[PDB]
Amino acid sequence: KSDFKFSNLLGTVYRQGNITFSDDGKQLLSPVGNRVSVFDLINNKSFTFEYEHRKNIAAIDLNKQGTLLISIDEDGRAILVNFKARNVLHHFNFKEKCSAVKFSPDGRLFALASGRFLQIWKTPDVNKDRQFAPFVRHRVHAGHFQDITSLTWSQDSRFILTTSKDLSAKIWSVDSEEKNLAATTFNGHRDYVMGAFFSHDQEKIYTVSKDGAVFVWEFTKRKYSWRITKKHFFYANQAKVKCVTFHPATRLLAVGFTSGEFRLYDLPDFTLIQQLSMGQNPVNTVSVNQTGEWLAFGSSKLGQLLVYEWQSESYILKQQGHFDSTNSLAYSPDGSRVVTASEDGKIKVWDITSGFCLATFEEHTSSVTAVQFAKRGQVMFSSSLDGTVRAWDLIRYRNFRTFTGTERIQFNCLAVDPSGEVVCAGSLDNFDIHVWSVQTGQLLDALSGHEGPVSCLSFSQENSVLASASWDKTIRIWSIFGRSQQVEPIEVYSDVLALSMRPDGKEVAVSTLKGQISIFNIEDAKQVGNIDCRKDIISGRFNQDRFTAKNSERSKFFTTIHYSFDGMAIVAGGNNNSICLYDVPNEVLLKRFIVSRNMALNGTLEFLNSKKMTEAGSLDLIDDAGENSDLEDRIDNSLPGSQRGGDLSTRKMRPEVRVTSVQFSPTANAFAAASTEGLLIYSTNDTILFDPFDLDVDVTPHSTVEALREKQFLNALVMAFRLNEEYLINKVYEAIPIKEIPLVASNIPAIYLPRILKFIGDFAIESQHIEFNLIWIKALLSASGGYINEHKYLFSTAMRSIQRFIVRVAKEVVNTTTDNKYTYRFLVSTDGSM
Amino acid sequence: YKLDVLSSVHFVPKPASTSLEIRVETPTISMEDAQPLYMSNASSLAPQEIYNVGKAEKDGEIRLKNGVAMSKEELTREDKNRLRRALKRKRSKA
Amino acid sequence: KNSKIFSPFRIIGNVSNGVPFATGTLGSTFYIVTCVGKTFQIYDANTLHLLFVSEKETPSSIVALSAHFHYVYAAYENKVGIYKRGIEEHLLELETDANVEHLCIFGDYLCASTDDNSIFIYKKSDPQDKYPSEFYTKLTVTEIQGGEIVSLQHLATYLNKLTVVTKSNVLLFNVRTGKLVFTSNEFPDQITTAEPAPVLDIIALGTVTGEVIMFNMRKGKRIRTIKIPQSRISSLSFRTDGSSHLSVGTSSGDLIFYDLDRRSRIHVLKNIHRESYGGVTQATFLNGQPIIVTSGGDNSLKEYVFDPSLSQGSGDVVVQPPRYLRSRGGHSQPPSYIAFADSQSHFMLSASKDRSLWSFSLRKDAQSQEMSQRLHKKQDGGRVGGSTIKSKFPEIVALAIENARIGEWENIITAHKDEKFARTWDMRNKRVGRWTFDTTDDGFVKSVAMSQCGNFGFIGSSNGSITIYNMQSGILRKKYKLHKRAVTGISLDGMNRKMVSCGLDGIVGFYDFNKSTLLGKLKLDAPITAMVYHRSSDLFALALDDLSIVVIDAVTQRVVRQLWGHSNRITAFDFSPEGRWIVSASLDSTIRTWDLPTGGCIDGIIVDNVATNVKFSPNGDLLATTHVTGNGICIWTNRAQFKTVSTRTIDESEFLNDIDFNTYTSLEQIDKELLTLSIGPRSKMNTLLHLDVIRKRSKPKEAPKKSEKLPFFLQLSGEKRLGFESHFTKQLREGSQSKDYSSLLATLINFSPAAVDLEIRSLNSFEPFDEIVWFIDALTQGLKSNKNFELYETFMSLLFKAHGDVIHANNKNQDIASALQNWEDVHKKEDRLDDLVKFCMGVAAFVTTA
Amino acid sequence: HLGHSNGTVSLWSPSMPEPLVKLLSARGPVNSIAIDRSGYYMATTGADRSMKIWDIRNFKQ
RNA sequence: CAUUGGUGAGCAGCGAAGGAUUUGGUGGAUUACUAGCUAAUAGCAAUCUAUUUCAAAGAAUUCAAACUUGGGGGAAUGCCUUGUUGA
């Protein structure tokens, strides 16, 4: 209940740097800002490592034995990761800027193109334990004149050649004795050589340069060595080559351009297989399978990922996650989907398990600031700054009606009647709560009475009173249904923002500007208590700041709050660096989560370094933009005081750290906080934790199993619930037979009914037993359903996990059987032909 | 785009907007992004929107809005009266 | 004594021990090697970072060190390591049983000198070779020739001559021949330390009486002599800047500087290293630079510099006295009580018998600082009572730290040895806090704790009283009185609701803290030395005097686990980060690893030096132990984070694999009745049902541009009747013979969804209808097994899209309908989930809504 | 004298809009140039690990 | 009578061979530690020169190139672009 971990980051499928597949076709590794997130294209699951990387990743390599992972900053830090242990092995520092990391094809020893040096290192053994200094450097080769920009290996382990910003391209052999075999330097291009490669026979070397030229080097005559046999030209007009890979067993230069294009070739022939438009923004990285038939592209401007199959001319994914620009959230009534707003306007529908967006919604013109669901997940509402709140369908993907005001007002926030009749929205311009009906797109009423704007709006799910949240320091609770039209204001101390209501329908949790979170009653105007949040908020000092991080008033409040569905915990998050988990009765926070550790983002550090401060100004505020080689980087088009604006170029600041909107999951103790880096997901699906309940000395895991040999089936379930460990429970849940399921399921005590319902809800989704799991849910609902009705709120996370299992996977098996059952009846009974 | 970026997006909306759009019936896995799953299986056009009941082309029949078709020859004169009286008040409402 | 869980990472917090450090020169920069016991270190000299530590521990202590440019020559007991980057690249073994005292390098030769007055010569096997490897010869010195060997020096410009200095006199050996080319005269004093000079032909000498003797070798005479009162000279060095300067390092902690031109001392340094631990063991002017590097035996290493002279015209007479520059610090004494500071395992507090607390860094080893002891001037205005000759705080026996409100007030409470109060410390400012906490009943503080909110500070007196001081103001709030003997551990739960305490009278009292009521009171048998609470799960463990760990649930108020197996007093222990382990260290010189579910030890580590404290990280990665001898902190890497750990009670041997590796794979199927799914992803039904719609949306909008010259057989070109039939139809056909399909359907699981549409559309049936009727009889034989109920019905439905035109027109054939009745006789049984889901739906909709 | 990525050191003058005379100094680009104070002599340094010594009076290296 | 105002005389109290305020300079941190240099599979580090050269490889838009301009109006002379006269 208390220990959460960073389980998943969602959205921003690619940010910067190298994108590599697994040894197989299966696991796709793409960088996010900090973390090497792991996608599984076949066995549809997603996964993101818990380790922070201190700046943005520049490069990634995967061990061909599927075991070691290296991710390296812009500056040159380095981290080893075990895959199958999901954990950090060693933190290494390279003292210069790195450009490409690739292992051997053998897997023994990895190379690093850092600065103008080629560094060749022995990888540490995996099964050997962690030491102080696990890396052993083989050699450092130094023959280059400017920075080395790429790297490749041979197909044997024994040859490595690099490409530089120097025009050269030099072959290095690994062992010193094979130096005499190959030491020559390839040159002759006109601009930056960005790739050089081997064919499947190592006789021929191709080179690829920024200007658009391909050479074919070959050990040929005029005792004779390495002429250019034939030149090939892309003829890119104002496009330039940006990243190129080459699958040598299938002869494919997958080539990306600065004009968003992409070409394919077959290299002794140079026949253009196919040319695509991948976007308006430049292709920043490519890589291939080992088998050569998934490609993987990412433009880093919008931050989109494109996995392309080339033989059948079809995508696997063209996904786009967006950065610094997700305003609000909503979990579905099912646990399985999270809908994020944007600042573009696009409303995406993200999946938790396989972390890609299902659909977009591209009807709004400007940013979207609130999203909520209603009506058991068919509809989804969204208030924009376009001047409208639009309804949506999820069965058909369409607007119902676009609700608008009278005099065209902005809409911040939104509240939907649980019985989906009424949609309420609130502004900054008007401070009048507009109220639309769902059927008739007219506004029913303009509920007014606030000084200052409405921050948030939300409905009871119990009796459907709504409660507004002004900036005249007053909650005002409305009652809008049925001949009453009566109003009750509750004054608070400072400007409130981001209300939320308990699923009881009897309490309202507020987040004022003094930091403090107060909890009011509704049927009375008085408050239960308040919990103090000004101290346990971590605040960043920005780079351009002039005050200490201790006494700035930027971030010490909370711009969101959401009660858990138990009604016992609040998760709060604001423009600060931190997320909180307050307990509601005991009034004490449980654990504080730092959202990100990036120097790249602004609001991270409590204390900046002192060596950055030169007598005139910080050494981060200096424009490095004019130093850059390309034109497109140097053009500063940032508008003067644009904050949280349209594009990320128009800041002329680093992006701020802010957690915009936070919600709990319905099912499984998860909560998602929508960050700058992208939508975070915290969870407890590990359960590597010993949280026992009512242990005697007699209860051991040796004792529960011996109750199963003794056929003592109700005891061995209760003896396994006392440990609250999942592998003892799966030992006894899968053991006991059908004939004593309803005898056991009734005799379960009333204490463990949340545990077994949180178990079967979480276990049956990814487990093969449909028929065995449903006999449990038949037995538990029938034998002890009346206890479930009394404590509805202690089970609403457990039951929702069950009736997601029934809708998502159980009904679709039924409907396919039903489709099988009726198609049989039509064909075998009706008449033939001719 | 430039002026709203200066103004720190807070955008005063356009006053009026009237537009027609044309939707094409597709099985609505084909309206979502490239990803190997889906949430919606049916067609994008609603079943009401691909068949409204309509007045029959023959003069000898009258079809109502619910699907209760009536010929002109199986009516009684008192049922002829009410239907002309019913189509009186709906036509006069416009 | 090999453990299965832990493995040592390195020892944190040691700099030197007394063995003379030796400097090496790279280009224009300087590196200092030191040693720590059996594992030497390397420091840069430009900023004193840690650059290299050795890869393995040596089998004994390193006795002497020297370093020529890249290669560090380390000399433990019988052998000499020739190390590069801390890696042992060549081990050189000396053929005696004597232990090597001193070592020297010049030219092609290595010169190692054992303790029994014998000198070994090792030659470079080739002038290309970098480390000398071949045994050249054995030089001996009989006691009629000279005394015991003080040192080995090689002076400048002597072809293979080796200046062997002894306690009596000075020798010279031509190591090519092996002959004594010159012997000096006998000295009236016992020589202690020799060092060469930047002038020609002169070695400097140091006696046990305070006399430095310059000694020429070409004249064989004493050129200059310098008398020192009452000092045992331990180190000598010459400044090579161009100004003549001698640095004499005593063994009474003094460093003394001379000016040989002016024949005067310049400035004498007092107590730069401790007299008791050895004084200045080695001091060295770096070459051509005004930097002397002093490293005593008291686990420090300091650099001192000479500022330029203030006089314009005079210069060499008015000399600035030396100046403190950077240094590194460790504990001189072994650490008494440590703790971890934060969650990311980034600082460790360590308080030792040196009386000085240190915030060591696991992360970067130049980040470690002594927490200051400089009392805040009082709010009240009256002056602070203390001795004016400032002495350090008495040594620290109990520490508590909660990190929740750091940087705003104090968050570290320490209890000093034999003081009726117990001070506080700020973590961020690295300083003693402004508040001191008294016990108000004149008892000694034996145990402290803090609230998780960081507002309350618990103090457990040795007379029962538990005073709870607040942490803003240091004000008194509540005083609890349950115990009568010494309280030896307090804690507060995670919720700030319930509070425990443990006494030496055996009472384990359970308090409420919101209300001030005593919830309950539990009495065990033995007196109770210490308590470690675990706030995540409300389990806490006690250490008794009947040598057993008792673990007590904090909610249900009863002993849950009791752990037997120790045989002497349990020093300290800690829970795992997840409550799954307890690691306890005791005076039986063991470190065990208890396992709370199964109630037994799973790993027993016999360490020869007894471990005083064991502390896990809050993260699940590091384990830190502090021993009785030695100064630093041994850090253990956790294999459990990278490997599953068996849970067997193996300890009794030295001194259900479901359960042993604590993981459980599911059944494939419980019983033959139960329907199942396919193992793996749940999208395999959906992609098989919707493969045509997915591919119609996956494609690009427009056609990609092709060239006209394309290889027609491009897919086949990838550079590296019944026999012509595919493997599926052939395995169907052989399956059609034996009327069985169990090996067939194992293939249909392992096809790709891309393959299955290409496969079932290829069933070759127009007139005879063999292959359809064989394929239906595969699916009916599938559902009789009840495995993979999802997929086989989708293989059924995929027929009716591909061949539903065909089997409809050839309905009422007796061969097809024989299969289809055999389908429907099988397919009727699996309505029993459709009658099961609707009950599972309609109840759960009725229960949660209504 | 400008220097380009061609390697063509180009003499210029504010009256004529064409270069006065082009000079293929080195292969690749031109890292720097310098001209003797007398005006006779030029020295170019291309990025092809090369270096030329030109005579600007007669345009012969 | 009240000071939540300024100055300045005293006392209780706190009080180990002194106390308080203010400030110059240097060092160690302020992200996670695999050494310096060069012509770099090696050499130096007292230095690369009386081996530092030859050989090899190396020349696309047959001469693409302001994605970069505050807004109106003009541009004689320039320049650009096209057309043309003449050799």
Swiss-Prot record, chain A:
Gene: PWP2
Source species: Saccharomyces cerevisiae (strain ATCC 204508 / S288c)
Family: Belongs to the WD repeat PWP2 family.
Other remarks in the entry: Present with 16700 molecules/cell in log phase SD medium.
Compartment(s) of residence: Nucleus, Nucleolus
Listed name of the protein: Periodic tryptophan protein 2
Mapped WD repeat ranges: 11-51, 52-92, 93-131, 143-182, 188-222, 236-275, 278-318, 321-360, 363-402, 406-448, 449-488, 491-530, 553-592, 654-692
Signal peptide coordinates: none
Subunit structure: Interacts with snoRNA U3. Interacts with MPP10. Component of the ribosomal small subunit (SSU) processome composed of at least 40 protein subunits and snoRNA U3.
Gene Ontology annotations for the cellular component aspect, listed alphabetically: 90S preribosome; cytoplasm; nucleolus; nucleoplasm; Pwp2p-containing subcomplex of 90S preribosome; small-subunit processome
One GO process term, biological-process aspect: endonucleolytic cleavage to generate mature 5'-end of SSU-rRNA from (SSU-rRNA, 5.8S rRNA, LSU-rRNA)
Record keyword Ion transport present: no
Swiss-Prot record, chain B:
Compartment annotation: Nucleus, Nucleolus
Domain of life of the native organism: Eukaryota
N-terminal signal peptide: none
Recorded family membership: Belongs to the MPP10 family.
Function: Involved in nucleolar processing of pre-18S ribosomal RNA. Required for the early cleavages at sites A0, A1 and A2 during 18S ribosomal pre-RNA processing.
Assembly and interaction partners: Component of a heterotrimeric complex containing IMP3, IMP4 and MPP10. Interacts with snoRNA U3. Component of the ribosomal small subunit (SSU) processome composed of at least 40 protein subunits and snoRNA U3. Interacts with the SSU processome subunits EMG1, IMP3, IMP4, KRR1, NOC4/UTP19, NOP1, RPS4A, RPS4B, RPS6A, RPS6B, RPS7A, RPS7B, RPS9A, RPS9B, RPS14A, RPS14B, UTP1-UTP18, UTP20-UTP22 and UTP25.
Protein name, as recorded: U3 small nucleolar RNA-associated protein MPP10
The encoding gene: MPP10
Residues of the full protein shown: 446 to 539 of 593
UniProtKB/Swiss-Prot annotation, chain C:
Keyword Transport set for record: no
Protein location: Nucleus, Nucleolus
GO cellular component terms listed in the entry, alphabetical order: 90S preribosome; nucleolus; nucleoplasm; nucleus; Pwp2p-containing subcomplex of 90S preribosome; small-subunit processome
Example GO BP: maturation of SSU-rRNA
Keywords per UniProt: Acetylation, Nucleus, Phosphoprotein, Repeat, Ribonucleoprotein, Ribosome biogenesis, rRNA processing, WD repeat
Claim: Repeat is one of the keywords in the record: yes
InterPro entries: Quinoprotein_ADH-like_sf, SSU_processome_Utp21, WD40/YVTN_repeat-like_dom_sf, WD40_repeat_CS, WD40_repeat_dom_sf, WD40_rpt
Ranges: WD repeats: 22-53, 63-93, 101-140, 150-183, 190-227, 234-269, 277-329, 336-370, 397-436, 445-479, 487-523, 528-563, 565-606, 608-646
Function noted in UniProt: Involved in nucleolar processing of pre-18S ribosomal RNA and ribosome assembly.
Domain remark text: The WD repeats are grouped into two tandem seven-bladed beta-propeller regions.
Protein name: U3 small nucleolar RNA-associated protein 21
Organism: Saccharomyces cerevisiae (strain ATCC 204508 / S288c)
Lineage of source species: Eukaryota, Fungi, Dikarya, Ascomycota, Saccharomycotina
From Swiss-Prot, chain D:
Annotated function: Involved in nucleolar processing of pre-18S ribosomal RNA.
Protein's name according to its UniProt entry: U3 small nucleolar RNA-associated protein 7
Subunit: Interacts with snoRNA U3. Interacts with MPP10. Component of the ribosomal small subunit (SSU) processome composed of at least 40 protein subunits and snoRNA U3.
Each WD repeat, start to end: 25-61
Tree of life domain: Eukaryota
Subcellular location: Nucleus, Nucleolus
Note: Present with 5800 molecules/cell in log phase SD medium.
